[PDB]
Amino acid sequence: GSSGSSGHPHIQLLKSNRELLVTHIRNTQCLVDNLLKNDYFSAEDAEIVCACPTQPDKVRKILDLVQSKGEEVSEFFLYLLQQLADAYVDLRPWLLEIGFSSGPSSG
């Protein structure tokens, strides 16, 4: 009778900062619109997000959904936070602390 621990460097980042992401993130429809076109969020999934009463609920709902899928979607969902961070206000210093991207940008 033994057991190990879990990891998921991408999924853990969502759970750990699940309370911060709900306070920083505001636009949820955009996250779904991009995921819908990328074939990540199904009609049944988006139906749950919009079903939320407020925004703070939508963000938490999406995070729980992505975590249910796996690292495949968690990697893409977290990526959008960076590429979009350029057009954000609350999201910026966090990415700099966790460090999502790496390596120069030349070539």
Closest of 56, 60, 39, 58 to residue 47, by C-alpha: 58
Q: State which CATH number among 1.20.1250.20, 3.40.50.970, 1.10.533.10, 1.20.140.10 fits the domain covering 1-107.
A: 1.10.533.10
How was this model experimentally determined? NMR
CA 58, CA 63: separation in Å to the nearest integer?
Answer: 9
What is residue 5's three-state secondary structure? Answer: coil
Site of tokens 């729980």? 64
Task: Please give, one letter per residue, the 3-state secondary structure of the chain.
Answer: CCCCCCCCCCHHHHHHCHHHHHHHCCCCHHHHHHHHHCCCCCHHHHHHHHHCCCHHHHHHHHHHHHHHHCHHHHHHHHHHHHHHHCCCCCCCHHHHHHCCCCCCCCC
Q: Which two tokens stand for residue 23?
A: 């306070």
